[PDB]
Amino acid sequence: KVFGRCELAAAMKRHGLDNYRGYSLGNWVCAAKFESNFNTQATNRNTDGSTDYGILQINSRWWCNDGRTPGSRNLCNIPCSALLSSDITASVNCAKKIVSDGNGMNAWVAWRNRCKGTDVQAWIRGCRL
């Protein structure tokens, strides 16, 4: 599925991301925009044997198990295929873990490069929340 901006914002709000660990909703929407272009099926296969999965491009070395990645930790305790669903629940639950495991949103390269320091409220402006 390719989400709309406001539709994704509402889904992320329903799942408790607004102000999760001090990150406003627009940060999460911005991260998804630049990680995956709002596409739940996005995959990026890296040369290091790992793959980034889903709307938040969560990597298979630390966070989910795909059976193919060296050094797997599976800290979210999920198969990576769960991150390719049309429903965002598994991606949101794992994203919450990423931040709870002592990372901030700097764990997402697209957040740090394209969202940090910007007016991230723009990403939820105009939306029914």
UniProtKB/Swiss-Prot annotation:
Q: What GO molecular function annotations does the UniProt record carry, in alphabetical order?
A: beta-N-acetylglucosaminidase activity; identical protein binding; lysozyme activity
Output the PROSITE patterns linked to this UniProt entry.
GLYCOSYL_HYDROL_F22_1, GLYCOSYL_HYDROL_F22_2
Reactions mediated catalytically = Hydrolysis of (1->4)-beta-linkages between N-acetylmuramic acid and N-acetyl-D-glucosamine residues in a peptidoglycan and between N-acetyl-D-glucosamine residues in chitodextrins
Q: List the disulfide bonds.
A: 6-127, 30-115, 64-80, 76-94
Please give the coiled-coil regions recorded for this protein. Answer: none
List ligand-binding residues for substrate: 101
Where does the UniProt annotation locate this protein? Secreted
Xref: Gene3D superfamilies:
1.10.530.10
Q: What class of enzyme is it?
A: hydrolase
- What main location does UniProt list? secreted
- Give EC number(s), comma-separated: 3.2.1.17
Q: Any one cellular component term from GO for this entry?
A: endoplasmic reticulum
This molecule's function is given as: Lysozymes have primarily a bacteriolytic function; those in tissues and body fluids are associated with the monocyte-macrophage system and enhance the activity of immunoagents. Has bacteriolytic activity against M.luteus.
Q: What is this protein called?
A: Lysozyme C
Which gene does this sequence derive from? LYZ
